[PDB]
Symmetry: D2
Subunit: 368 residues, 4 copies
């Protein structure tokens, strides 16, 4: 069964009782028992488990809540390894919340697999990896990270948001736990805040169930329905997005006002071979450098189809400046040391017409 | 402005943009900014803050998530005091999750105020109190607990679910943080899983905001709308429920098949004076003893308007046996030591006709 | 089974499949059949049929659509009798739409039963009656109108919106078809636009089904759920509203700035005996006269809890001036001839505190 | 601005007040005015007007309600011309409802443009055309029908459901009114029952507004939101569907168990040139003949990805037998006279993998 077919018929998204072709929305809190588990959420959990070739699905009220639940698998004193370019909510939550509970985090450049091995302490219990990462799209060898984690008794976790289960399946490569900010591509319509988590480990799933039930970050039934609905067009949107990405990159790495381009499809990109060995396609997130901050602001204004926004994975294309929005708290020269130059622009390719998206960026790049 | 009026006009539950008399449902995840916080949830947070005479409201995906967020105000090594008859999700989460993060919990019979003072360690940071508690409805002196907590530098938290803000306002009595399982009376229609938290402390609210944003247990916009909608009839439902409670208790403490009755309205009930000094009315939860487990099961079957269910605060009345449902894991003789006798029945009074609810219980009690 | 109990347990509003205590929301358009009718709407139709002691329920996308469907029971050439003080959507639709299809309408003062008999033509097929009517609250003898209609072979229809099924049951008095603008009291929260229609006639119900299916004005599943949810508090809201009505009228017929008061509870009101003989209570709609248009506008501004709005049956109380809003198209002196004086005010009593609602009106009436 | 871009940015589907990227859902019935039109529905009406290059949009509670509203533009005595192969709800409503109101309907084979001219009576006021029609997909010359209608003073109406506005724009060809059963492709997810109507005529739109407001078949705000959401992927779904259609037809017109194939893409299909002159693509509906009824039932059972269902325009592919389902009421030999042979199968191509959909049908056709 090919990929686009699995999105329509994978999982259980119908009603056995009435034959309804869509999951009923169970706005309800209690269920009567004949004598002395929301079905809408059970449907979306069934979908993510199917799409990731897992056995168990979990739906949280946000990607942040999904990550928080996974971290709570550890106790005080345990160490977790992350890719060093993590930022945003994940870095913020681990360093400013979970360290207060004795959970210690060590950031590691995981683009080199052996860096993970050097960082393993006797108290390390979890290896958490984003690939590709944000905003420079560093690629990490999923299959080797799984082998390292298994050989050292580590719970392996991959944030698969940027690739979606349509292009990258970490569970197939031996990873223990895969998770998504379903707010992005999975929902795909900028109208659901949600997290999704899949696993095949019976015992890890049981621990995840207890944590979720004891900390209460559950996804509501209305959001669960909108998630299932949006996932049904995941393959059509990702393929359209991938089509535009290839053409936009060709435009980008040929325009005089564009210096460096960051995307795993580029052959000179670090670990480009590794990405192709673990993925079927590409994320819609691209980063590129213009001359300076002044040019980046002009680019956003001259652009007609790129909306200035912070998120990604929408139907409409999004544009942003990391150095001005997500990394304005980091000192200016530390930004440069890690690549977040003042003229670095990030775009999230939507599902508009490919030629419209290529020409709109060029006519704006021509204004510099 | 009297109470029933405040439920209709307290908080901000209209749309300034269009004049809509109800809060628009913002199924959305990102908001565009002109140049380089969900309004539906902001509405329900505005309501609970108003109803509790607080300054800041917070809406979580469940009461469990609300409690979890409040506990995360502490660090590893901090101690929290609870009323010793806590059970269910709150006890389960504190003892099986948060102890793994070095947060130590000490249970205390808070029906005696001075018991709190004996239990205060140098590492105690929080005092968490349910009143009335479950299922025997023990009453705790809110005002004195607030004085103790303030005098010792303790964050004071009251679970106000059973009374609702319509009858008991812990913030008015000096408590730092008040919280609810909005799944119960506030939503009131058995169709929303939600938590609500109110405070007047600017600094506590700021810490709560960071925790909520870093752990992601947020209430969805559709559930937030249904919460605001249900709260609008809170006073009408609580007053109808209170009307039935008084009559049912009179029936209960006069029937030969009924031994002990547990409810704070009874004058011989422990701290009955204290409850009246801090409350305007009563919870719809009542506990009473029949002869044995056999009689309790017959009572549930002979009853026509009491539905066998686990929850409370619905429009329909609910019946359950704690020793068989919520406390079947505790050994049989420890149950007896704490009052959970095998023939103890708990009911949640709904909004059916009062005479219908009194006569239905009696005709069932007459079958024993 | 008393009234408040029937609102909670009448009809079928649970899920047999899962035991859910609330009706699942079936956002769906097609249902699979094993080999070669929306349950959410079927639930609300079950409720209105139960509440009106009918056999068949129908849910339309608006009260206008409900009335339109009922009128389409007739063919070109058929005559329908209405109470002469009909206006708004019903009058507008019959005179400006259905007359173009050869359906002829005759308005009749039905406060006198024998007026109906004089108006019966050989081509009369339907008798349509609002009681109490708008905005002067004229009362029509339901039981006698049913006898007249049956004796002459007329389909009898009563618009029961103002009384709701909680206080008036036209089907019990022999009427063929009863209908509501569920937008008002039934939904009760100013957030659902809906119509409801109940009947016991098997053959009339079959014709209604065909019309509804052939003209497509069906109520959606989300609105159907919110309708069922709102009806559950109908008795609590109507009784609170009735409590405020009695006190407000006592205030009104004793204030010097108030001339005539229109409400069926007043003993000098026309057919006051008839209303009490067919009803258990009162509508929340009241009309009263101040001196002039200038005073009416001041009254609306000086009022703190009465919101200037056009609708009725909300949780918040509403105030309006018919001569300025619903009847500004009728010439000035025809308004006077029918009682719509320039200082006539109409209020829809909500569920705020009774004393708050009485004192707020008086302090505003004192400003004149 | 190319087509896929217009689906994302055409119309107004954001919130000016907050900057929300999706239309707020206005569950509300009344809007307050400062001193003496649902925005969610206004959004979907804005979209269909934009997508069809019209000036005015209208959203109804069903396609049936949309058609009913359009027919009510006429008075008793007026004649309407339809394509003779209309059936289902449209034929049923016109012949069994609107004839009772003196609206006379004349069916005409409109595949020949001059047939319309012969059928024009002095009382003809409207020309209503489906193209392609159901289930044999007859094609009608839209541009010539518009010229005929304008030359004779006829309101021209095209049911554009099968093509969607992505492939066929009747307003651009001079048609007065275009309408859709948005339940099908526009919503596209089998979860919204809705009609949509667009026009550029200021006066026709005004009459449509009055009819809609006087008959009340309005689309709810929740359904309006789900409609806007589904339309955003219209181009991606239609193009995927069109891709599968071309390949399935090639498979179909080469399999020994398949006799006649009905689809406008086939060059021998009647008016194939006309369709290409007025359309950019194709509908997903295909009809083909197997040997007999026995083979058709085997085909449905042997098929793995075609679901036995009555509707069309879903994400999953659908299969049905007209002679057994939609035309079982017509006598057996009249079916043959009009082409509805007992072995005629109709499919609605979904968005599954193209190769999966071609191979699944062949392996099932091979079982005969």
């Amino acid at each position: 069964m090919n990929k686009k077919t699995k999105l329509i018929h994978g999982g259980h998204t119908t009603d056995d009782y009435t034959g309804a072709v869509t999951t009923p929305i169970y706005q309800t809190s209690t269920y009567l028992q004949d004598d002395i588990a929301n079905p809408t959420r059970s449907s979306v959990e069934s979908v993510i488990a199917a799409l990731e070739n897992g056995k168990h699905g979990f739906a949280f009220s946000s990607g942040v809540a999904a990550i928080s639940a996974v971290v709570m698998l550890l106790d005080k004193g345990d160490h977790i390894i992350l890719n060093s370019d993590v930022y945003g909510g994940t870095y913020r939550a681990l360093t400013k919340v979970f360290t207060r509970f004795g959970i210690e985090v060590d950031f590691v450049d995981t683009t080199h697999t052996d860096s993970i091995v050097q960082a393993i302490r006797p108290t390390t219990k979890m290896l958490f990896i984003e690939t590709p990462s944000n905003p420079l799209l560093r690629v990490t060898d999923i299959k080797k990270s799984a082998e390292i984690a298994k050989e050292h008794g580590l719970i392996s976790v991959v944030d698969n948001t940027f690739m979606t289960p349509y292009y990258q399946n970490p569970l197939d490569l031996g990873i223990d736990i895969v998770l998504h900010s379903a707010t992005k591509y999975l929902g795909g319509h900028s109208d659901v805040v949600a997290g999704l988590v899949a696993t095949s480990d019976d015992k890890l799933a049981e621990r995840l169930a207890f944590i979720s039930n004891s900390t209460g970050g559950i996804l509501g039934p209305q959001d669960s329905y909108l998630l299932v609905r949006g996932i049904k067009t995941l393959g059509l949107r990702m393929e359209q997005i991938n089509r535009s990405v290839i053409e936009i990159i060709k435009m980008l790495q040929a325009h005089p006002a564009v210096q460096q381009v960051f995307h795993p499809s580029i052959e000179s990109h670090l670990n480009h071979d590794v990405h192709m060995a673990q993925a079927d396609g590409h994320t819609g997130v691209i980063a590129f450098e213009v001359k300076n901050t002044e040019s980046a602001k002009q680019l956003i204004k001259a652009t007609s189809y790129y909306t200035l926004a912070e998120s990604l994975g929408a139907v409409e294309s999004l544009i942003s400046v990391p150095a001005l929005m997500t990394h304005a708290s980091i000192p200016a020269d530390i930004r440069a040391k890690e690549g977040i130059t003042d003229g670095l622009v990030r775009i999230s390719v939507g599902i508009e017409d490919t030629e419209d998206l290529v020409d709109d960026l060029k006519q704006a790049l021509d204004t510099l």
